[PDB]
Amino acid sequence: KEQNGDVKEAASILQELQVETYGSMEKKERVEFILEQMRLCLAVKDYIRTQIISKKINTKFFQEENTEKLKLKYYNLMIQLDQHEGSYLSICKHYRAIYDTPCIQAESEKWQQALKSVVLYVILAPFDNEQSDLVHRISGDKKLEEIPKYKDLLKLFTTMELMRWSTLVEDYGMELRKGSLESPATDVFGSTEEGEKRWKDLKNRVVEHNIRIMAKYYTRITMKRMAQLLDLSVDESEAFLSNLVVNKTIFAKVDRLAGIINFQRPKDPNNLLNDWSQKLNSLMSLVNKTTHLIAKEEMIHNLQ
Amino acid sequence: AHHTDCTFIRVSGSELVQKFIGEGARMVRELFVMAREHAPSIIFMDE
Amino acid sequence: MQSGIIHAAEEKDWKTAYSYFYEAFEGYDSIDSPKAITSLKYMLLCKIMLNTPEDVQALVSGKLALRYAGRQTEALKCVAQASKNRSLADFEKALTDYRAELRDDPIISTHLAKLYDNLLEQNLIRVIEPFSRVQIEHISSLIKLSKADVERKLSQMIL
Amino acid sequence: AEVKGVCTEAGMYALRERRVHVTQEDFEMAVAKVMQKDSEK
Amino acid sequence: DVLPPEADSSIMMLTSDQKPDVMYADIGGMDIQKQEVREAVELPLTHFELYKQIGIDPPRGVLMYGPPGCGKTMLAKAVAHHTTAAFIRVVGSEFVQKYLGEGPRMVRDVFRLAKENAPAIIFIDEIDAIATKRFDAQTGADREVQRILLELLNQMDGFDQNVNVKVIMATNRADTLDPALLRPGRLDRKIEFPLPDRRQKRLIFSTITSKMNLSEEVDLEDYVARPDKISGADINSICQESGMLAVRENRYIVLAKDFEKAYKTVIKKDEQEHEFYK
Amino acid sequence: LQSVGQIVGEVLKQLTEEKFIVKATNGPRYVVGCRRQLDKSKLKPGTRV
Amino acid sequence: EVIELPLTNPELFQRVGIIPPKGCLLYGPPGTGKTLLARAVASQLDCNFLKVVSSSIVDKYIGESARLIREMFNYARDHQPCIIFMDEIDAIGGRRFSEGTSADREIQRTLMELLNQMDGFDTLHRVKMIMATNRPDTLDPALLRPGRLDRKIHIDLPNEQARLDILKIHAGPITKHGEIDYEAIVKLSDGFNGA
Ligand SMILES: Nc1ncnc2c1ncn2[C@@H]1O[C@H](COP(=O)(O)OP(=O)(O)OP(=O)(O)O)[C@@H](O)[C@H]1O
Ligand SMILES: Nc1ncnc2c1ncn2[C@@H]1O[C@H](COP(=O)(O)OP(=O)(O)OP(=O)(O)O)[C@@H](O)[C@H]1O
């Protein structure tokens, strides 16, 4: 700190940081000297070494009883580092973790906007099952009515259906440019490069939501129709289906000569006969017995 | 010994094989009372 | 190194060449760099062409390979990236970008051929995956190639 | 005695290059190594 | 009634807590014996088809011997840690028991379990405890050991050359070993563990010192030139007590001024040969 | 009169939950079962009984 | 350094990254302070100390010496802090034999098995072997091995100041008139035992 720090001073620090870790843990000083070089190595614009030596402070918790001013104030560099690449679900779980101290420090100025940010870019992560578990977790908390537009954010929760992008833009231009707090909008869309990356990310989101809803409730579908529901060109549509079928996320056969495709799988006679068999057994055995015995209960209830 | 249909026998003087000849068999000549039971036989051993 | 070079002509096994270049590494380690870098580019070179998608990045991640991060390493890793991504245009762009440091091998014929057509056939299998039936001009525009060459390549790929 | 050792070790050489057939250089390499063993003691 | 096979000698090896976690990089610079032990048990247990299609009658069992502490145990530790198939071991003295004839059961059941379980590898050590030269069939005490030798030697031969069971033999003194036990068909491959002198000495130095401090100038190649045939095991002792010397002075980094007194502490073999005789 | 239940052995392996193999400390092994309140899962191979 | 420090302060060893030493041995002329240490060290904990004469182990039966030392090591593993002690190990030590008699068989068997029990396929953790013998000239190099027995400790004949302090210790229960030059007895003493 005498030389105000540069690349060379931080490189000088980087070697001896683990020496006291082999010496002794103290829960206040040693974590501070485990995290100062986190900040320095972030300033060197190095991430791989930074995250490897960051894998020591992750277990350094339960100390929050007296480490309130120190614990999550060094958590900003983990979200910065994971913001350097695409690690959206990781930093969503990070913000879900980083909520307890602002809850203790509740005033809804450094408290509410954290919740607004995390629920805002939970959407920014790709579709995922434990992502759905997390959206079940974060939904239902008694502060979400404080955000007025969260009821509009409930659209991308269940009963998916159409997500017309022009409607979203018309609804969200003000929430991106104005607001009482407005800070996550600046963090996500307010920047130039980060804003455009979030823009194309949200476009990718909404188009894959439409892919999922068409996967749920369609047998066959035409390109003119799915293009006009997608509010985008046929060529970029076919490109998106091509680069989403190589990921094997959604099974489809997007055929581009006559104009009609199917979403279904070629149907195995073993599979169809099996499905008929199991539905036959279940839904004419157990519900049949249940109906018989509740008829017995019904005649037991009234006159014998 | 195989071509001549003669019982090939060889002894190394080990003590594992000692119990197959006699209870103590302190000499070596004892071998004959079983060797003559396979009269087409040939005696061999190493250096 | 000589055995690995010489038996990399009939194109039978490169794991022998891989082992030769490995023991060349621990021979030349910290004592002979000008053989070490060319042996490293040879080892990654022979490993990639036998369908090792991520093994290039994994094997260069070792510290003994981290210490030799020269232009040959970026050449091989971007070649491996284009191979695992099938971006043939990116493959040719990387070939042009590193052509000064990609012509250094005395063996060139193994690489401007015998990997180009391979990459082309994985381009074919990556573009056929979305559809079931197509017109030829659509896929020709998608891959940015001619027709007759693609026609005959489709003939072999159906044979 | 060493002849069978040479042929077995040539087959061993044959097995370390992953080949279904032993070649003429395997035999000479094997007898060269056995000759080097003969040079020892 | 018939039963599934069972052995109690070496249950199996639960292998989750039984792996010695010894890496091939941990053993210091012994490329040779690692090479023919990979050729000996590792490759034939997997590529048995290669051995039958070349027809070079892959070895039933390989014996390892030599001076004590040349790494004969850690080789077994490493191959047991790195094997994919099953493995089993027993200390080579439990074949003598309180009562009569338990030992033949103790070898027959473990061979039966090796046959039943998998293409496994069985490790037997200290054959000198079980294989001597002469015998006195009047003690009763000896009678069990030539017996158990008898049965092991027989149950060697009960293999069809198709079962992929490999036996690895360890001992210290090869003089006591009976030659018919090492006769071809039983132990057709023998390997000695020589004391490293110069080629491997800097290698074992580097491997054992990779985990140490060695702050800026602690030289090692000045120590590789020192004569008088330092063994393999005692290098571990040198590093160990050098660290003891470093920790006694309450220093967390070993310095070069430790190693010379550390070296003269351990070896201590002064001359044992008067120079005019030379 | 009923504390005669004296002999000590060691269990070898689990055949079933009621079929067990044990070895006496004198000699021969045996096939033995258990009463229904001895925690048969607790009878690992390697314990004295 | 090996018997007390790692048992209470093991952390410095993994700070420097090496295993503490597995055991040590003592040697010297007869009666030259070994078991004083051993009956002096034995007066420290009295709960982790097992101590044998290296002679009660052998028995006329078949192999029960191996059995008893097996369960001895099992007991050592039972209570993780334990200090084992075998004195006058010559009775079990020897060099080796090429089968002169027949007792050599099972006593050497017990020896071999003891070796594989102390460093074979096991982390003998927090168990220390301290040895004692009158003459190490008749011991197996397998038992003498630095991997097997780490540090060898010699006890010599006591020095003049050492003899002075020893006799002063033995000048505890004395009744007399004190006009004694201890230096005279010290100077006349040469090559004298500790006893
Ligand atoms: N390459 C090596 N050479 C020598 N010792 C080594 C080597 N690698 C590790 N060691 C360690 O050095 C010491 C010497 O080997 P160790 O004591 O295991 O003897 P061993 O030969 O393995 O056993 P034994 O001789 O009883 O069969 C041990 O601590 C061992 O773990
Ligand atoms: N350094 C010493 N200081 C005091 N007394 C000593 C010393 N060395 C030996 N003695 C005396 O020697 C006698 C025997 O002691 P101890 O039984 O411990 O013998 P030891 O030195 O272990 O050797 P050994 O077992 O061969 O007799 C005791 O009376 C003890 O007072």
Q: What CA–CA distance (Å, rounded) separates E240 from E237?
A: 5
The CA–CA distances, whole Å, from A142 to A112, A133, C29, C81, E253 equal 11, 18, 63, 47, 56
How many Å lie between the centroid of ligand 2 and the Cα of residue G30? 9
The reply, when asked if residue E34 is annotated as ligand binding, is no
Q: What is the rounded distance in angstroms from the CA atom of residue G57 to the CA atom of residue C106?
A: 74
* Residues A101 and A65: beta-carbon distance below 8 Å: no
E246 touches chain G (CB under 8 A): yes
Q: Between D12, D18, D22, which is nearest E39 by CB? A: D12
**Which residues touch G193 (CB under 8 Å, ≥6 apart)?**
G29, G30, G31, G32, G157, G158
Q: Tell me how crowded residue E254 is: count the other CB atoms within 10 A of its CB.
A: 24
Q: Do E266 and G96 touch (CB under 8 A)?
A: no
CA of E3 vs chain F CAs: smallest distance (Å): 9
C146 and C154 Cβ atoms separated by less than 8 Å: no
Q: Is E54 on the interface with D (CB under 8 A)?
A: yes
Q: Is E142 on the interface with G (CB under 8 A)?
A: yes
Q: Determine phi and psi for F22, rounding to 5 degrees.
A: -130, 160
Resolution to one decimal, Å: 4.3
3-state secondary structure at position E230 = coil
E239 assigned binding-site residue = no
* Residue A23 with chain G: CB contacts under 8 Å: 15
Is residue C29 helix, strand or coil?
coil
Q: Find the farthest-apart pair of alpha carbons in chain D and give their distance in angstroms, rounded.
A: 35
- Distance CA(E166)–CA(A7), nearest Å, equals 58
Tell me how far apart the terminal alpha carbons of chain F are, to the nearest angstrom.
Answer: 21
**β partners of residue E187:** none
Q: Where are the alpha helices (DSSP H) in E157-225?
A: 201-209, 221-224
Looking at all shown ligands, the one closest to residue G123's CA atom is 1
- Report which ligand 2 atom has the smallest distance to the Cα of G40: 18
The answer to whether A233 contacts chain C (CB < 8 Å) is no
**Structure tokens of B21?**
């000849």
Q: How many angstroms from the chain centroid is the CA of residue B10? A: 6
Our answer on whether the CB atom of E73 is closer than 6 Å to any ligand 1 atom is: yes
Whether E69 lines ligand 1, by a CB cut-off of 6 Å, is: yes
- C-alpha C91/C-alpha C99 separation (Å) is 12
Residue of C nearest to A255 (CA): C131
Question: Does E71 carry a binding-site annotation?
Answer: yes
Q: Work out whether strand F20-24 and strand F9-14 pair parallel, antiparallel, or are unpaired.
A: antiparallel
CA neighbor of F40 nearest in space, from F10, F19, F24:
F19
CA-based radius of gyration for chain A:
27
E179 vs B18: CB contact, 8 Å cut-off?
A: no
CA G135/CA G89 separation, integer angstroms: 9
Give the number of other CB atoms < 10 A from CB of residue A87: 16
Instruction: Please tell me whether residue G65 adopts helix, strand or coil conformation.
Output: helix
- In this structure, is the dihedral angle defined by the CA atoms of residues C119, C125, C126 and C127, taken in order, positive or negative? positive
* Other CB atoms within 10 Å distance of the CB of residue A231: 15
Which amino acid, one-letter code, is at E135? F
**Do E128 and G112 contact (CB within 8 A), yes or no?**
yes
Contact C4, C17 (CB under 8 A): yes
Distance from CA of E99 to the nearest CA of F (A): 7
| Cβ neighbours of E191 in D, within 8 Å | none
DSSP secondary structure letter of residue F33: -
Q: Answer yes or no: are the C-beta atoms of E107 and E95 closer than 8 Å.
A: yes
Positive/negative CA dihedral, F17, F23, F25, F26: positive
Backbone angles phi, psi at G132, to 5 degrees: -155, 130
Experimental method: cryo-EM
b/e A246-267 (16+ beta carbons within 10 angstroms → b): eeeebebbbbbeeeebebeeee
* Residues in D touching C13 (Cβ below 8 Å): 17-18
For residue B44, the surrounding DSSP H or E stretch is: strand B41-44
Kindly list the distances between the CA atom of residue E256 and the CA atoms of E222, E243, G192, in Å, as whole numbers in the listed order: 11, 11, 40
**Is G33 annotated as belonging to a binding site?**
yes
- G144-153 burial, b at 16+ Cβ within 10 Å, e below that, comes to ebbbbbbbbe
Among E238, E240, E229, E232, which Cα is nearest to E269's? E229
| Cα G112 from Cα G105, distance rounded (Å) | 10
Which residues of E, range 2-61, sit inside 8 Å of F by Cβ? 3-4, 6, 8, 11
Q: How far apart are CA A78 and CA A90, in angstroms?
A: 10
From chain E, the residues in CB contact with B18 under 8 A are 135, 137
Whether A238 and chain C come into contact, CB under 8 Å, resolves to yes
Determine, for residues G63 and E237 on separate chains, whether the beta-carbon distance falls below 8 Å. Answer: no
The C-alpha of D1 sits at a distance from chain C's nearest C-alpha, in angstroms, of 32
CB C123 within 8 A of CB C92: no
- Interchain proximity E54–D8, CB inside 8 Å: no
Ligand 1 atom 3 nearest Cα = E232
Say if CB G155 and CB G34 are below 8 A apart.
yes
3 state SS of E62: strand
Q: With CA atoms as reference, report the closest residue to C13 among D23, D16, E41, D24.
A: D16
β-sheet with F29-32: strand ranges across: F9-14, F20-24, F29-32
Cα angle vertex F23, ends F18, F29, to 5°? 85
Q: Which of B10, B11, B14, B16 to mutate to test the interface with E (most CBs of E within 10 A)?
A: B16
Q: Do chains G and C touch (3 or more CB pairs under 8 A)?
A: no
Describe chain B by its helix, strand, coil percentages, rounded to 5.
25, 15, 55
Pick from E80, E45, E77, E29: which is nearest to E197 by CA? E29
Side chain identity at D18, as an amino acid letter? Answer: R
For C117, residues 6+ apart whose C-beta sits below 8 A from its C-beta are none
Residues E229, E195 contacting (CB under 8 angstroms): yes
| Residue A228 contacts residue A216 (beta carbons within 8 Å) | no
Coil, helix or strand at residue E122: strand
Q: How far is G23 from chain A, CA to nearest CA, in Å?
A: 26
Q: Is C77 within 8 Å of C69 (Cβ atoms)?
A: no
CA distance D31 to A21: 58
What is the C-alpha to C-alpha distance for residues E88 and E80, in angstroms, rounded to an integer?
8
Contacts of A227 (CB under 8 A, 6+ apart): A233, A234, A237
Q: 3-state DSSP call for residue A275?
A: helix
Pocket test for ligand 2, best of G26, G27, G35, G36 (most atoms within 8 A of CB): G36
| Tokens 């000239």, located at residue | G137
Number of Cβ within 10 Å of residue E96's Cβ equals 24
User: Is D17 in the C-facing interface, judged by CB distances under 8 Å?
Assistant: yes
Q: Chain C interface, mutation test: which of D15, D18, D23, most C Cβ atoms within 10 Å?
A: D18
Location of structure tokens 């001992």? E171
Q: Which atom of ligand 1 is nearest to the CA of E70?
A: 21
> Would you say E38 and E83 are in contact if contact means Cβ atoms under 8 Å apart?
no
Neighbours of chain A (3+ CB pairs under 8 A): C, E, G
* C-alpha to C-alpha distance for A92 and A124, rounded to whole angstroms: 9
Q: What is the DSSP letter of C67?
A: T
